[PDB]
Amino acid sequence: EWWKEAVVYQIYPRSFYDANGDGFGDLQGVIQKLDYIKNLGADVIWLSPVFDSPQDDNGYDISDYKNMYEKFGTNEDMFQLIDEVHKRGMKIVMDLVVNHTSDEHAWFAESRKSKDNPYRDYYLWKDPKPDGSEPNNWGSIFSGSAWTYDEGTGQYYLHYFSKKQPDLNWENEAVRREVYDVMRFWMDRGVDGWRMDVIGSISKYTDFPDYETRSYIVGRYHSNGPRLHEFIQEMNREVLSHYDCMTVGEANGSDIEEAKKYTDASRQELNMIFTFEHMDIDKEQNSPNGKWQIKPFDLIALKKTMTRWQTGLMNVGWNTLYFENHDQPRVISRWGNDRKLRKECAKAFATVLHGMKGTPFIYQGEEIGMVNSDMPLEMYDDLEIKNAYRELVVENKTMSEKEFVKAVMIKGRDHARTPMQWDAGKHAGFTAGDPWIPVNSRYQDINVKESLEDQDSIFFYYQKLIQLRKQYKIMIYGDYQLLQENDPQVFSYLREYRGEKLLVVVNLSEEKALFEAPPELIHERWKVLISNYPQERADLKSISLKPYEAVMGISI
Ligand SMILES: OC[C@H]1NC[C@H](O)[C@@H](O)[C@@H]1O
Numbered sequence: 001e002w003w004k005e006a007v008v009y010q011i012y013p014r015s016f017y018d019a020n021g022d023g024f025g026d027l028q029g030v031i032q033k034l035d036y037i038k039n040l041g042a043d044v045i046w047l048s049p050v051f052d053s054p055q056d057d058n059g060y061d062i063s064d065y066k067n068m069y070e071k072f073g074t075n076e077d078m079f080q081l082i083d084e085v086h087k088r089g090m091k092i093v094m095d096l097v098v099n100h101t102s103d104e105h106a107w108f109a110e111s112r113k114s115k116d117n118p119y120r121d122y123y124l125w126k127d128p129k130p131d132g133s134e135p136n137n138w139g140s141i142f143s144g145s146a147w148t149y150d151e152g153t154g155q156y157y158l159h160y161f162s163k164k165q166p167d168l169n170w171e172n173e174a175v176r177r178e179v180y181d182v183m184r185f186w187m188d189r190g191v192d193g194w195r196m197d198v199i200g201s202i203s204k205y206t207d208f209p210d211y212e213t214r215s216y217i218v219g220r221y222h223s224n225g226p227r228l229h230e231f232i233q234e235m236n237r238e239v240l241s242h243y244d245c246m247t248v249g250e251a252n253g254s255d256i257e258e259a260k261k262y263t264d265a266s267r268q269e270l271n272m273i274f275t276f277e278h279m280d281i282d283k284e285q286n287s288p289n290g291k292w293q294i295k296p297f298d299l300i301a302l303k304k305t306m307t308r309w310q311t312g313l314m315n316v317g318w319n320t321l322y323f324e325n326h327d328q329p330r331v332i333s334r335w336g337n338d339r340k341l342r343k344e345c346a347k348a349f350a351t352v353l354h355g356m357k358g359t360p361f362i363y364q365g366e367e368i369g370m371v372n373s374d375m376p377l378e379m380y381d382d383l384e385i386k387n388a389y390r391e392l393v394v395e396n397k398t399m400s401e402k403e404f405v406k407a408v409m410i411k412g413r414d415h416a417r418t419p420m421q422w423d424a425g426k427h428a429g430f431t432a433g434d435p436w437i438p439v440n441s442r443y444q445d446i447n448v449k450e451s452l453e454d455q456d457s458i459f460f461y462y463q464k465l466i467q468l469r470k471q472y473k474i475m476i477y478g479d480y481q482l483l484q485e486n487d488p489q490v491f492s493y494l495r496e497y498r499g500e501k502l503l504v505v506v507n508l509s510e511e512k513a514l515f516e517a518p519p520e521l522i523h524e525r526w527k528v529l530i531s532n533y534p535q536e537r538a539d540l541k542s543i544s545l546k547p548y549e550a551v552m553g554i555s556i
Contacts, residue, residue, distance in 0.1 A: 018432070124204065145216055275320075503540060
């Protein structure tokens with residue numbers, strides 16, 4: 001169970017480091033930056049997908065599971081990376097993307113040819129309605145219908161994501177066997193585990209029932225299908241049980257009850273899952289604009305949600321801890337201050353997360369406080385934006401252009417995908433060429449070089465949080481109790497382990513706040529383990545908190 005004690009660094013490789021100068025981050029670039037990641041202190045790297053792919057969804061549309069996309073390199077580069085990771089005592093986790101393939105995968109190129117093609121049932125084909133329309137009213141996560149018509153065979157195929165991402169038919173045992181072969185191919189070559197892309201979607205309701213009623217709907221049927229956990233238990237039996245591996249499922253649609261199904265060790269499924277419930281607190285529940293209908297940051301909602309996951313998986317299963325990935329904006333821009341208080345704010349969110357029970361995930365650039373971009377809408381790359389613009393602004397007019405732009409400036413996935421900022425030179429030192437997407441305009445002030453030269457950097461704060469997790473067993477194995485539950489500024493909680501107490505107090509606001517210890521804790525003596533402000537005190541019975549002040553103390 002080394003995965004319980006791990007800290008994971010997530011790499012989005014096309015934006016991490018470009019070794020050959022074409023503006024596209026590559027595998028040799030990752031290799032050159034492994035020493036940086038090890039010095040930070042992560043011991044597991046999760047690579048977003050580098051498999052061959054036409055890049056309709058930047059690698060999450062896979063056309064060959066057993067070869068690299070040309071701009072990342074060759075399998076020989078991938079094998080070298082695996083060796084270089086292991087040489088440094090680290091582990092490498094790959095992205096398993098098996099809810100769907102590219103429509104340019106050989107399986108689909110065969111499948112679509114005819115209803116009697118041997119690969120026809122590798123995907124999900126349905127007749128039109130009598131009037132020619134789609135089999136049902138299901139929507140794609142990237143706007144529009146979940147179905148696309150094939151003129152040649154007169155049937156629609158299903159895609160929860162883009163039209164170039166047809167969903168695999170997991171009802172077909174041959175499909176499941178192909179997936180397990182891919183897993184064994186890579187695990188036999190040293191891959192230490194898998195992050196499983198939208199694993200909550202692999203089981204469908206084969207009736208494809210309409211949602212109740214907007215033309216296209218995404219809801220309860222898009223995840224948690226009737227055979228989901230049967231399939232994952234099979235995957236464990238056939239593959240995962242045969243390897244010393246780590247698994248994290250990207251569990252779309254997960255609540256805390258579903259998380260127990262996924263992560264209870266006695267169920268022999270996965271080690272941990274990503275949920276979206278803490279990421280969902282700033283969208284309206286059921287707007288036609290989905291994620292783009294933004295609500296202000298609500299700390300009470302964050303506290304209640306994260307607390308439900310800490311208590312729900314306190315003594316069974318295991319949590320993941322994240323605020324950032326390649327699908328989320330920079331958290332300090334989204335929910336905090338990314339200007340005069342950027343360093344304090346970045347360290348505050350880091351303290352909230354890393355003081356909890358679970359496996360922390362650091363997204364590339366989070367550890368230096370990277371921020372959202374001011375680039376104009378036409379410089380965004382993500383197909384999600386182009387498609388939502390068409391549906392929400394042009395066709396349905398449920399958002400004005402101005403409000404859509406404002407929402408994309410807060411939540412667009414490309415705020416995670418601008419190049420990693422290594423120094424204040426050209427293109428922040430990401431590339432000698434022309435980057436595939438613009439470098440954030442603030443890179444001269446925010447970059448790895450200045451971070452390593454500044455003892456007060458966010459980077460060294462993250463490095464210390466990781467050191468503390470390795471030093472203080474209470475951080476890995478202590479229980480969890482929310483304090484000051486209804487305080488709208490202060491996120492405070494207590495971990496307990498073998499008579500020790502860990503107190504975490506974080507002001508997640510720009511204004512002065514007040515922490516008062518619960519009365520039974522007022523006479524404890526504390527050693528401050530970390531704070532984003534200087535501390536010289538052993539009593540924490542009341543703390544007058546400055547903007548974004550974070551304190552972590554251990555009882556003595
Ligand atoms: O594969 C579809 C979808 N799954 C979730 C991934 O994190 C996201 O980047 C991708 O677009």
